[PDB]
Amino acid sequence: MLIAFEGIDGSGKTTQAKKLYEYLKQKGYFVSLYREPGGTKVGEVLREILLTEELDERTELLLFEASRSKLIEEKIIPDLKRDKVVILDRFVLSTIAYQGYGKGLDVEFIKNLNEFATRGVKPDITLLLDIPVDIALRRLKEKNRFENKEFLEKVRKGFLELAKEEENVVVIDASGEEEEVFKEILRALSGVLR
Amino acid sequence: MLIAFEGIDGSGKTTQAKKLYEYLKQKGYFVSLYREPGGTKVGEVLREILLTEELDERTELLLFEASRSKLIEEKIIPDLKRDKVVILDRFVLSTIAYQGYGKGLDVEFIKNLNEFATRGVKPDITLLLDIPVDIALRRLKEKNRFENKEFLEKVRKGFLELAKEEENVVVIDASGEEEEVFKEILRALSGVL
Ligand SMILES: Nc1ncnc2c1ncn2[C@@H]1O[C@H](COP(=O)(O)OP(=O)(O)O)[C@@H](O)[C@H]1O
Ligand SMILES: Nc1ncnc2c1ncn2[C@@H]1O[C@H](COP(=O)(O)OP(=O)(O)O)[C@@H](O)[C@H]1O
Ligand SMILES: Cc1cn([C@H]2C[C@H](O)[C@@H](COP(=O)(O)O)O2)c(=O)[nH]c1=O
Ligand SMILES: Cc1cn([C@H]2C[C@H](O)[C@@H](COP(=O)(O)O)O2)c(=O)[nH]c1=O
């Protein structure tokens, strides 16, 4: 089964995805954990380009999708066939929120690309880690990571509209303390798997 | 203005595009020459991935477009704005013929990605270097390059259907000698330049 974490930078996805990976493993699931972009040899090369180079927004979209396509074909589809629980730190809603709502690229076009890269694989559940931008930015600032408030305000709202419009997205209050956040996530998952 | 060379591997695009670059530069044009994939620092990184890694055909398609998008935004659009003659070694028809006719990906979808990557930038003329697959292969074998005959037969045909279906495409008989081929290229261009 497929569990996707989504949300703005500094919402706790890395943290919570790893917490979930260890928890489910301990419970006897066979689990995989992948980040996007990245998660394959080729995707990681693309992730470094995306994080280090000055790119226009079109080229960026196409690289995010290329990384996803490699991950889907190389790892996610084979994992799912073997009944692994696949946990993703970011997936298709990040593309729509960042490239669409943030950068103003066309949302229907993005969805079509998403569908092409995924071969239509969709999550059983998406956990949206919702958090006020200013709180995310203080968390990131502690680790010397700076992100753009005006941009992230639009991205946050994108994610929240997607949570209303798209299937199987649960809005998590990610402003909580780590353990409380994790317990909300467990409650959200409780219907989809044991 | 924008001039694109298309065709199968070993049809002579590198050779003829550089010929044309030198010719036009001597005539006093300010000229650029770019290859696809590649042609920018980032595009060349992508080209090396495309040429060296084992990729599925969807990831390939997306990397070809990403290289094109970088080229268009970084180089082609500003070049055209300055009235350079921009010469491309491969462009959007290669994607359709290779990924579409060759690998069986959806051609409308390909075209939509092409339109996105290019911002609608189209060539003034495309020179399709048409050649029998056997001849191209022989040319390639002499430089220790080997390509797939079955695949390339489909791609060749794809390019020929597109020369019929698409606009501003001239079919060049690329089977001749270098100067004979350049001669037909100059004939086709005097329609446009
Ligand atoms: N619930 C929390 N409260 C406060 N800080 C947190 C919480 N969860 C994670 N952090 C810290 O906030 C920062 C961003 O968390 P991270 O998991 O990397 O977020 P993301 O992957 O969404 O950008 C990290 O320094 C992390 O240790
Ligand atoms: N008209 C020609 N006749 C015979 N060989 C040629 C001709 N044009 C080019 N070649 C040679 O064929 C090979 C492929 O040409 P190249 O320009 O690299 O093709 P492409 O870029 O279409 O793959 C090269 O070794 C080149 O020197
Ligand atoms: C997956 C994905 C991430 N991103 C951005 C969000 C982050 O700011 C960066 C990924 O970094 P992160 O690994 O720190 O979560 O990539 C997009 O803009 N679009 C996408 O499709
Ligand atoms: C531009 C382009 C090239 N290709 C292929 C054609 C060549 O076999 C390969 C390397 O190109 P080259 O030898 O002409 O430089 O890339 C595609 O499959 N799709 C495309 O969109």
UniProtKB/Swiss-Prot annotation, chain A:
Protein name: Thymidylate kinase
Family, as annotated: Belongs to the thymidylate kinase family.
Gene Ontology terms: cellular component: cytoplasm; cytosol
Enzyme Commission number(s) from the entry: 2.7.4.9
Entry function: Phosphorylation of dTMP to form dTDP in both de novo and salvage pathways of dTTP synthesis.
Keywords, in A-Z order: ATP-binding, Kinase, Nucleotide biosynthesis, Nucleotide-binding, Transferase
Presence of keyword Cytoplasm: no
Keyword ATP-binding recorded: yes
Record-linked SUPFAM superfamilies: P-loop containing nucleoside triphosphate hydrolases
A Gene Ontology BP annotation from the UniProt entry: dTDP biosynthetic process
Catalytic activity: dTMP + ATP = dTDP + ADP
Major enzyme class: transferase
Originating gene: tmk
Residues that, per the record, bind ATP: G7, I8, D9, G10, S11, G12, K13, T14
Gene3D superfamilies: P-loop containing nucleotide triphosphate hydrolases
GO MF annotation list: ATP binding; dTMP kinase activity
